[model samples]
Target: IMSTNINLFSSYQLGELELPNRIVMAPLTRQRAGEGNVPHQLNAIYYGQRASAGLIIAEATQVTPQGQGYPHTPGIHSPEQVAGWKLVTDTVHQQGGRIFLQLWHVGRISHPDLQPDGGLPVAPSAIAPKGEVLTYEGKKPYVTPRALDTSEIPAIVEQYRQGAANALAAGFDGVEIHAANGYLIDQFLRDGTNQRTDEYGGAIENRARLLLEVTEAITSVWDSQRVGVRLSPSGTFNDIRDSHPLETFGYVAQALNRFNLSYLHIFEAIDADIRHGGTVVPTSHLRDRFTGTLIVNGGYTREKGDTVIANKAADLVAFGTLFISNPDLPERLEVNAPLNQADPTTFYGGGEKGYTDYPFLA
Candidate 1:
């Protein structure tokens, strides 16, 4: 049932911000940060080139050194890191664009070489994800992570609080809590990674407690409307699963209605996630539960994006690899221009070749 015949380019009111279009640039990891895992001039340029997006959710950024999982990923805890992000924000704003930072912590999806002082990665359980973790030395088998004690949870929440404040100082329009893709918060949210019997685990309410606590901490620094949360209810990335995803994520989405956030980002289960045995919990589940704006991601094409909006199934559509290959994506979509193909070879750590070199419609 088409509601009002809305299209992808229609303006959207995201809280106090008015977006020029509904095409969002999903947060992507290019691993191009500087020596100290800090954003640099190159990152600034890369974002500047894609400033045409209605809203750009910047790459997942570590809130603390121990939050890091991959090499060369950016962090926001240091003064230098904050200074670097200031450039990125300014570059986007200067081009009349809005950008939000995704605060992230990769719980057990890390190797000892990537952790602080060769320490074990932390998770809600000591279970190791069945895969290899990329490190400076190369790929290494996932190590069994140390489970976080109940008492240590508050400090983790505080890290997100500090990260939110830092993102404000860096001139971001807002911040998105990275509760997706089996990250730290995701580890606590799912039963596969969380075997704790404490208040931060066990029942659905307990499993979702850490995420809510982090949301409270983050919103303490920013307006509730200025903060967003990303959740992957169905996708089984990073070897994560839930006994009752429909019930678990249904509870998570309904609980989040209390915040009235900028939006609830739902990463729908794509074919690959389904192939890995991920249960397909449709976005309509959250679209029904969450009261605020909704942003849907994971393999959305132009026609499908428009249809979803017209059907009122989602308020916004976020494109990942498409944004990488088309700097002026909104314009390309507007005129139906051919988008440049992204190179798999340089999707990770690289220079201007595959990043800022993406051409805009001439």
Candidate 2:
């Protein structure tokens, strides 16, 4: 008999949808989309093989041309992108699995080469980040992005609005707003990246305005139960920081309760060195503020995830790297089977060699 905890594999209600287990596959960036940044049959096969996850949050997909920061990351804006995703969603559903498309906008994390006609990437402020962007040519230094005019904020929200609509058309069960990981929404939410003096910046409420607006736009398209938001309160990735993370994220979490969203996905990288002296805001603190289902991610092991869920710290736990090499992760957990190691080199922009080739326990 297996000694694995049964709570992790137990069914739970996530909004109107009932998930088979509490293990969710986090949104991972596998830059396999070919020309025009569209999902294809290979992408479908990869996800289809991992359909055993309680819920699979698909890769970060660009919502517009300016939203793309790297080559070959999938997009949800174009017709071809929609058709391609349709094949993916259809395949996942055929395998009796549910999936959500992670809507993304990279903001200042982009380079001119990735933009249209060598245009500058747009962000909440004209600040330059400290890392390099992976371009088609090669790794290049990050440049200061163009700050959006106040009048252009609505258009920014519309990008998410359209992306939400597109995800539904592509047959996704829901859409998870990629507000975490220092993307466009995170750029506005954090003080380190946003220096604007307009309504979209300054105080906590102002800084959180863009995120709420984008969520509202998305909710307008899909029911509140089908819309989700992701947030990284203490992440320093992409050179992001907040003056008072506790106050900023606390207010954001309290505000999100009004929308009745399906879930609030929080990335809690407790052991990461990226904190850089930042205050650690426990997920339990935010759990009290946000009334919806809470999903937590970041370097979680099976035992750790079970402990978190058992403690009621989170409703679901998302696994990123583990699901990469384990197609039937839930079953493997059920039987306490050994996991195949994932190759770091093949993690990004790879073919079936390291992707669909992962063996399933028979």
Candidate 3:
């Protein structure tokens, strides 16, 4: 029998950070950054309003210009960008909230226009995913990406290291490495996208090499306790697939134990039908394997999230779309207040109309 007493509002210590509750705001990409992909006061205002979350994982930010996959997404690779994010971090902290910057590199999920000098995007293999990528002009078909040369891999790792450093300088409490959602790190982690015969591919250990190396690099900057990693073991988002997800992710989970990082956030599919060719692996599989804070995300409600915590399947529950419209999500959930539906039309590339205009319960 699950006890309803263990609820979402409970407090838990994540490494050195003490979260006020178990509700986490997942990283959401709104694509409202200004020119040069720099965050501004508007971004600060939006995040500051949601400071009641136990922890806010900021949107996926590129580690380098070559890592960008979309228009208007922010970056942490430049001085101006760092300063821009400083304003956001300052606002969130002033409101008594802790936030983590999610470092991302799109790899093959990018177009040449988003890359430096209009160059081809880099990936573990030269495969072109079957889909379109959003660009400043419009949606464009994905093209064959240039496989990173063995010599160039270290530079990629260095980019993440730099991004982690910048996040700290910007006043972020910690950093989350985006290794999920079929992006650069996901492209390398999944066997379907990675066809390299080099040391970074071929076997599970080899395929996971880049991610492990990146973890080590970022951990070197802020230590393992201040770092977290996000992974989608069976996610089909962004045209990613795996031949053997169970074996692949099993190894990935077990390997992460060595790092002793702050937490491992896994994006589990809500149902079996939407799992692409894979099945929904129990979150407990990962929870049991990863001996650290476990955060589960997908389609979850306040009751469902509480159940997971009560069952001890996850230490925290992260809500994505729900947080977009509910600035005071914790309060709303506590009082059973009606949540404002998010506008899909303004989910991306919008101004304050839908970004920060969501009304809070008076």
Candidate 4:
């Protein structure tokens, strides 16, 4: 068996960018942005502290006003939001870090209260995800979304295209498409949330259309080598499901190969996913089909991260909760330093306590 010798800490040449390690910081939603969902100086301070990550895939920012689903999540649709992200990118770069902005749209994972003029959230179908949604007022029942008219789909793609352009102008190293975790693209990809009969439903290709078109739009602005796309197969989050995930994602991976992307970030199904009724679709499933760099996430420890990298199953490993409490996670893993436990209570929203006060190595 031709196993590789590289480990999690090994260096890699990701296209034109040189990664000092194989540790990536996942796009975590902290819900700590300032009013108007714009990043602020505190957010800049937070990202600067974690610049040790080989590549920091910043939090998922909404591409349009109606794309937002959670309270205080950042957006890149306006001038203020663009300046806000510029602050973050400048801070991260000043601290010697490379960062990529994750372009996101929540699709059906939203409540009407978070919509424009109290209009219904838009999705590929009118189906509602099971469970409550976090609204500005309080957690409320998920609402059936207004399915987008076929004529309006191009505007949806334009939103992402403009968002990508905004990220480029804001001084980000690249852009990542948030097609994971049952968000907009994920909703269109799987069968559970997508029941449309138009060009965006039925067969896998139709369901995969939004992702492909959005990707093409982003690539038109950014170089293919500087763009990334994230996917989560067997991801049951936000009440998403697919009868045959292996076949579905396998095709998506192959389809993405059309663009020479920076990397294909895949979030594997973990215990939490299984507990919530997700099937086990190993990260290797996509690794087999994608010919480019593969980055995997989902509760991986130092040992698990090294195992995946050493076995060539994935090119890099992203740490989510781990990065929350250890801003120096890459260095901590390098020297086998103890990691700090994250407080679940403060994981969502709060002040600097859990957001940026995590101590670094002495």
> In TM-score terms, which candidate is top?
1
lDDT of each: 0.92, 0.91, 0.91, 0.91
Kindly provide the TM-score of model 2 when superposed on the true structure, using C-alpha atoms.
0.97
lDDT of 4 by residue, 9-104 (tens): 878898899998999999999999898888999999999999999999999999999998988899999989999999999999999999999999
TM-score, cand. 4: 0.97
Candidate 2: tens digits of C-alpha lDDT, residues 148-173: 99999999899989989999999999
Which prediction has more favorable TM-score, 1 or 3? 1
Clashes of 4: 0
Worst 10 residues of 2 by lDDT: 269-278
TM-score of each model, in listed order: 0.98, 0.97, 0.97, 0.97
Model 1 over residues 1-362: C-alpha lDDT tens digits? 35565899999888889999999999999999997998999999999998889999999999988899989999999899999999999999999999999999999988889877899999999998998988777788998999999899999999999999999999999999999999999999999889999998899999999999999988889999889999998888898989999999999999998987889998888788677776779889888999889999988888999999999899999999999999998898888888899997888997998989988888
Error of 1 at 30 (Å): 0.5
Off by over 4 Å in 4: 1-4, 275-278
For model 3, residues 101-173, the per-residue Cα lDDT tens digits are 9999999989998888999999999999997888877888999999999889999999999999999999999
Segments of candidate 1 deviating more than 4 angstroms = 1-4
Clashes per prediction?
0, 0, 0, 0
C-alpha lDDT (0 to 100) for residue 194 of candidate 2: 92
